[PDB]
Design a protein around this ligand. Structure first.
Ligand SMILES: *[C@@H]1O[C@H](CO)[C@@H](O[C@@H]2O[C@H](CO)[C@@H](O[C@@H]3O[C@H](CO)[C@@H](O)[C@H](O)[C@@H]3O)[C@H](O)[C@H]2NC(C)=O)[C@H](O)[C@H]1NC(C)=O
Ligand SMILES: CC(=O)N[C@H]1[C@H]([C@H](O)[C@H](O)CO)O[C@@](OC[C@H]2O[C@@H](O)[C@H](O)[C@@H](O)[C@H]2O)(C(=O)O)C[C@@H]1O
Ligand SMILES: *[C@@H]1O[C@H](CO)[C@@H](O[C@@H]2O[C@H](CO)[C@@H](O)[C@H](O)[C@H]2NC(C)=O)[C@H](O)[C@H]1NC(C)=O
Ligand SMILES: *[C@@H]1O[C@H](CO)[C@@H](O)[C@H](O)[C@H]1NC(C)=O
Lengths: 317, 172
């Protein structure tokens, strides 16, 4: 009279299907999800410094559109641009908009240092009803609209050396009038010119006269340009008309700053990973929420689920 | 699996075993009973924990990158930006698919292996005092009371004690 001793293993009544080398679907006792497919719908305000653009693009905050004045000298890890943003100052364009937006976004600051430019023989602080500041006409806070003094606009020729140990970003522009009458009335000379240069580079822009579509009361336009000045270099600005002058420079940094288009609300919580859909957890190695991410994030993949087996083959009773 | 135990010579699993992954069922003079084997259970779990922690190991943190959505048609530069991202995503999607496939094949094989290891260990304990029925059960050819079973399960079973008795019952 002996005994029987059986060796065996567990099973569960409801297993999960996983994929292997040999099988599209095979049942194991347990698995865990490797693809993050959901978001809260909200951008957590920690641990990254989130700056909500509200009604302002980064570029409008940079130029100093009056309704974006609250952004003066702001900083960020992530600047968030909202689909409701609007411009409300003089109509403008930025040749290579995307690059200026990128380099500013990446710098992470709008810290602005005013410099004492001397504009001899012109009227300063020009404004427009297209860009109201309080009840009266106004302009981009960081730009200085120069026009004739008396009946003359002389050749402007100024320099600003960089004797600091950081890079300076100068934002400046050129005014494009709609008519010859406008050109001569503002700048005297029938054709203007703006040359901005360093030891290493030069940009010269000729204004073009002509109607553009009417936007916020003007058929005219301003085109926006930029110039970086390295330590030891010097800025020179030369113009016989149509200069939209810088008031100073923006301080540049390098680091972890970026920009994102999103309408997700900002909330009080902690999440390393941000997407335009909202923050997502980063415990999983992959995610299917959005290919646009910021921070310590799972890698974007096309699969909406991938199961890692965490148990043996399930062979029920 | 590669070892042929789980879903192999062991017909099925035990839904009743909730305190371990592998273990023992016995019938003797004193009745029937069940116990988990902790060592084999823990070996499987430790290996699976190991691979889980390797896989969920936070690999990347990215800040300013390229734009990936575009409000205007631009042509060449935008074609390239999209293609770069699409290329990246397909490569990562492939890595992810392959990773889970290899991981899961291996997890099944390693759990199958641990079943087999326990089975071979037990066979070796019992020496000439038992025989492999071929379904994961040993027929033990002697009086094995609950003390004797627990001795097999906790590694103290001296085979020399019951050898004479069992040898006699086997060779008839
Ligand atoms: C417009 O403004 C610029 C910037 O101030 C003027 O550039 C300056 O021009 C003077 C002479 O015309 C340069 O002087 C030179 O200095 C060297 C030593 O560095 C000296 O050896 C030479 O004999 C010469 O005198 C000065 O360097 C230069 N400054 C800079 C920063 O470039 C420019 O003259 C003005 N243009 C007009 C048309 O007035
Ligand atoms: C610096 C300056 O000259 N500001 C003016 C401005 C400019 O001359 C103009 O924007 C250049 O394009 O014009 C302002 O007027 C708007 C108004 O001007 C009338 O002459 C005209 O009849 C209207 O249709 C309309 O263009 C302005 O606010 O923009 C005045 C400002 O002082
Ligand atoms: C995250 O946001 C993106 C972008 O809005 C969503 O992508 C859209 O998904 C829907 C499917 O429900 C499609 O109709 C749209 O065409 C997609 N747009 C783009 C640009 O891809 C995505 O579904 C969101 N994901 C989650 C989990 O909220
Ligand atoms: C199996 O994994 C799930 C999560 O995927 C977990 O909730 C469950 O507790 C695990 N099973 C056991 C027996 O611990």
């Amino acid at each position: 009279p002996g005994a029987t001793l059986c060796l065996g293993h567990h099973a569960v009544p409801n297993g999960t299907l996983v994929k292997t080398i040999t099988d599209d679907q095979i049942e194991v006792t347990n698995a865990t999800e490797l693809v993050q497919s959901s978001s809260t719908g909200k951008i957590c305000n920690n641990p990254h410094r989130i700056l909500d653009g509200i009604d302002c693009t980064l570029i409008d905050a940079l130029l100093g559109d009056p309704h974006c004045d609250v952004f003066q000298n702001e900083t960020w890890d992530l600047f968030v641009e909202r689909s409701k943003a609007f411009s409300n100052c003089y109509p403008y364009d930025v040749p290579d908009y995307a690059s200026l937006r990128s380099l500013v976004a990446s710098s992470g600051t709008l810290e602005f240092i005013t410099e004492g430019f001397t504009w001899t023989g012109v009227t300063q602080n020009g404004g427009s009803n297209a860009c109201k500041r309080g009840p009266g006409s106004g302009f981009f806070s960081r730009l200085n609209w120069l026009t004739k003094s008396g009946s003359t606009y002389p050749v402007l020729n100024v320099t600003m050396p960089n004797n600091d140990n950081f890079d300076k970003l100068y934002i400046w522009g050129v005014h494009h009038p709609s008519t010859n009458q406008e050109q001569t009335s503002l700048y005297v000379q029938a054709s203007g010119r703006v040359t901005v240069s360093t030891r290493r580079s030069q940009q010269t822009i000729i204004p073009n006269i002509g109607s553009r579509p009417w936007v916020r009361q003007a058929s005219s336009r301003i085109s926006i340009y930029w110039t970086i000045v390295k330590p030891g270099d010097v800025l020179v600005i030369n113009s016989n008309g149509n200069l939209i002058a810088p008031r100073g420079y923006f301080k540049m940094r390098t680091g972890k700053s970026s920009i994102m288009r999103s309408d997700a609300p900002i909330d009080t919580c902690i999440s390393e990973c941000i997407t335009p859909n909202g923050s997502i957890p980063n415990d999983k190695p992959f995610q299917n929420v959005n290919k646009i991410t910021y921070g310590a994030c799972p890698k974007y993949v096309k699969q909406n689920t991938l199961k890692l087996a965490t148990g043996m083959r399930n062979v029920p009773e | 699996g590669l070892f042929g135990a789980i879903a192999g010579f062991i017909e099925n699993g035990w839904e009743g075993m909730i305190d371990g992954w592998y273990g023992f069922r016995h019938q003797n003079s004193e009745g029937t009973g069940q116990a988990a084997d902790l060592k084999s259970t823990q070996a499987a779990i430790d290996q699976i924990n190991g691979k889980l922690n390797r896989v969920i190991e936070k690999t990347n943190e990215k800040f300013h990158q390229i734009e990936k959505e575009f409000s205007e048609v631009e042509g060449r530069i935008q074609d390239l930006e999209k293609y770069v991202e699409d290329t990246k995503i397909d490569l990562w999607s492939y890595n992810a698919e392959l990773l889970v496939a290899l991981e899961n094949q291996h997890t099944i094989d390693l759990t199958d292996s641990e079943m087999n290891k326990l089975f071979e260990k037990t066979g070796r304990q019992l020496r000439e005092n038992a025989e492999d029925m071929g379904n994961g059960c040993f027929k033990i050819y002697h009086k094995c009371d609950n003390a004797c079973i627990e001795s097999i399960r906790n590694g103290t079973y001296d085979h020399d004690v019951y050898r004479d008795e069992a040898l006699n019952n086997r060779f008839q």
